[PDB]
């Protein structure tokens, strides 16, 4: 009865496509035509965080918009004071193959993970004043590519075993397992209300999950290669993805389909990171071509370039107050742009 | 200027000194290597001595030294069959050890395809490969037995002739020499089709009781680093 089920799935897909086409009343490019252009976004490197002696794979800003944590293949997890360039902490890592790092919204914890298939939680605030592994979250059967904190006790992680997970930090077990992706999940972004989150996998699909129920609410398919980055719009009703096809695409949750495409024939290098500004008007994407592009989320016309990295840009983050953008790269430096 | 600012600066200076010392200690005579291959290949048994496990479930690390020079060899074990993503984490290793089961003609084309993707990968273009054509004893047994014909899997073997530069073993059969050098050339044609000059392939015929693999890796890493230095100093 495989043929009958396949036909049922095909007609369901046809119905979904017809519904999306019916809901496709207009286009974002058409509606935003009258919008005044942003202009020329000139961002200059304000500070350069030196101290990493190897390729840099991830970073995450703090909720206070001043402290940020970075990860590298040298085995160090440095918490930086972006205001004064001072290194607040330097956490050695057991495994040098970490691919992600997170900073807890409360600021008391820092997480990291990589090819060890383990998310390690580090207690920044200790009575003895030192940093050490609080707990190690095990259970993923593939490399862990992204982890984001909901609070001091709950963390959502994505892994290369095609599954996202929600963890109970105190208990140390997976409260919820999210399944449905058919490829390695590369990146996960949380909603402003932390009730929903989206993930980008290596099947050119982005899925909306429900944190409490653990079900895939919606699926978005508009990419032609693996998605490497994802980020909710500040409103929380949309998100943007960056894929290996050298293209950013902005999807709407309520409209259930893609809105606008950010690509050009000049760019052929894949995208490694995306992020929005505080207003959501500017979409910043990091590419493999050694620099970044400051897109326009509405007009879809490139409005700036963040050049000044001597290798592939692996990570990119914007402060919660929008004051600064920190981009890390394989040349072992972080640059704060403003 | 403030007391808190001075204390923070002193802490930062101590941190920076600690990282500088750690980096100098870690980068001194230590070369990282990635062991790749299939399950049938004796990748776990390439380097015999110093199989010092440091497994974290995901990666089995082996450390060994030849002549006062330390080598770290990683074996990514606990991952899905898809590898186009986590292979980019190994784009700065000095060399890649590729292990091939020579006697297995069924999966030899799969091994060749894997070798060509690594070779032509964007992030692995500058990394040399130390190709270890394992199970030469079994390959010789297969050639002497003659039950399985390598021409069925590679039709161009009929028109193949043993290279002049071959160095056969004294007790080796000409058919075995032709077969092993045929496999070696199949790999080397792929290597030379797109090698850009920044990386090379170093093939070696090994068995299950070979104890010279560590020395071979030492010598090929020395050659790789010497060629890199010559290229950097515009001497090559």
């Amino acid at each position: 009865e495989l043929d009958q089920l396949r036909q049922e799935a095909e007609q369901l897909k046809n119905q979904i496509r017809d519904a999306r086409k019916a809901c496709a009343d207009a286009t974002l490019s058409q509606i935003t035509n009258n919008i005044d252009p942003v202009g020329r976004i000139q961002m200059r490197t304000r500070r350069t965080l030196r101290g990493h002696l190897a390729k840099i794979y991830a970073m995450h800003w703090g909720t206070d918009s001043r402290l940020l944590v970075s990860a590298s293949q040298d085995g160090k997890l440095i918490i930086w004071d972006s205001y004064t360039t001072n290194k607040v902490h330097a956490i050695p890592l057991r495994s040098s193959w970490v691919m992600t790092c997170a900073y807890a919204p409360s600021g008391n914890y820092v997480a990291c993970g990589g090819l060890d298939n383990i998310c390690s939680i580090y207690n920044l605030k200790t009575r003895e004043g030192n940093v050490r592994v609080s707990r190690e979250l095990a259970g993923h059967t593939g490399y862990l590519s992204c982890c984001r904190f909901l609070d001091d006790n709950q963390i959502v992680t994505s892994s290369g075993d095609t599954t996202c997970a929600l963890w109970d930090i105190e208990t140390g077990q997976q409260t919820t397992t999210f399944t449905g992706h058919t490829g390695d999940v590369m990146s996960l972004s949380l909603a402003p209300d932390t009730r929903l989150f989206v993930s980008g996998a290596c099947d050119a699909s982005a899925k909306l999950w429900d944190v409490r129920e653990g079900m895939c609410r919606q699926t978005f398919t508009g990419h032609e290669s693996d998605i490497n980055a994802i980020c909710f719009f500040p409103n929380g009703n949309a998100f943007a993805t960056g894929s290996d096809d050298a293209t950013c695409r902005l999807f709407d949750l309520r409209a259930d389909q893609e809105l606008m495409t950010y690509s050009h024939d000049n760019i052929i290098c894949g995208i490694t990171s995306v992020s929005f500004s505080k207003s959501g008007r500017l979409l910043l994407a990091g590419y493999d071509d050694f620099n970044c592009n400051v897109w326009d989320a509405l007009k879809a016309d490139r409005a700036g370039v963040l050049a000044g990295h001597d290798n592939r840009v692996s990570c990119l983050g914007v402060t919660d107050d929008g004051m600064a953008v920190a981009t890390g790269s394989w040349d072992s430096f972080l640059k704060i742009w403003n | 200027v403030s007391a808190e600012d001075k204390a923070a600066a002193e802490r930062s200076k101590m941190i920076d000194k600690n990282l500088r010392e750690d980096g100098e200690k870690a980068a001194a005579a230590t070369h990282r290597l990635l062991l790749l291959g299939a399950d049938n290949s004796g990748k776990s048994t390439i380097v015999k001595q110093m199989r010092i496990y440091h497994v974290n479930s995901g990666i089995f690390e082996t450390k060994f030294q030849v002549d006062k020079v330390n080598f770290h060899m990683f074996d990514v074990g606990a991952q899905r069959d898809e590898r186009r993503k986590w292979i980019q984490c190994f784009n700065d290793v000095t060399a890649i050890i590729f292990v091939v089961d020579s006697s297995d003609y069924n999966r030899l084309q799969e091994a060749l395809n894997d070798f060509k993707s690594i070779w032509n990968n964007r992030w692995l273009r500058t990394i040399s490969v130390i190709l270890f054509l394992n199970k030469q004893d079994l390959l010789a047994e297969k050639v002497l037995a003659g039950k399985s014909k390598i021409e069925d899997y590679f039709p161009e073997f009929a028109r193949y002739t043993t290279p002049e530069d071959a160095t056969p073993e004294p007790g080796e059969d000409p058919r075995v020499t032709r077969a092993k050098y045929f496999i070696r050339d199949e790999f080397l044609r792929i290597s030379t089709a797109s090698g850009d000059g920044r990386h090379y392939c170093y093939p070696h015929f090994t068995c299950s009781v070979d104890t010279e693999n560590a020395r071979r890796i030492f010598n090929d890493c020395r050659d790789i680093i010497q060629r890199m230095h010559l290229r950097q100093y515009e001497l090559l």
Epitope: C202 | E82, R83, R84, D114, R122
Partner: nanobody, 127 residues
């Protein structure tokens, strides 16, 4: 949505011929190298042939070299495989597959168990 719907296949006598097709949609066909993969019963997936973006660089597996001929039609976004002079060892489900990334000569995960950018498959049997 990226999908690769195939066609062709069916019963054929030994020494017969078949022409498999691949309707590619959802992506720029001219940008990606394309492959042909088959899975014999009781065996894993085996790469058969591939063709570059332009169509100049073409390679085949040794067991099918000379007989099979892959051709791509970038205008119509279709991939073909002229399967003439068939043998009973060629009975397999033939999947079309494309390399994960554009503008690349490397194709890591094509014969994977759960590859995403591959077709549903075409049942080819020889009797």
């Amino acid at each position: 949505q990226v999908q690769l719907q195939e066609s062709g296949g069916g019963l054929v006598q030994p020494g017969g011929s078949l022409r498999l097709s691949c309707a590619a949609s959802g992506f720029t066909f001219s940008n990606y190298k394309m492959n042909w993969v088959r899975q014999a019963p009781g065996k894993g997936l085996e790469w058969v042939s591939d063709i570059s973006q332009s169509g100049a660089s073409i390679s085949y597996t040794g067991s099918v070299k000379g007989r099979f001929t892959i051709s791509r039609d970038n205008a119509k976004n279709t991939l073909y495989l002229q399967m003439n002079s068939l043998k009973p060892e060629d009975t397999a489900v033939y999947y079309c597959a494309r390399c994960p990334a554009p503008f690349t000569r490397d194709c890591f995960d094509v014969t994977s168990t759960t590859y995403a950018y591959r077709g549903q498959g075409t049942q080819v049997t020889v009797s």
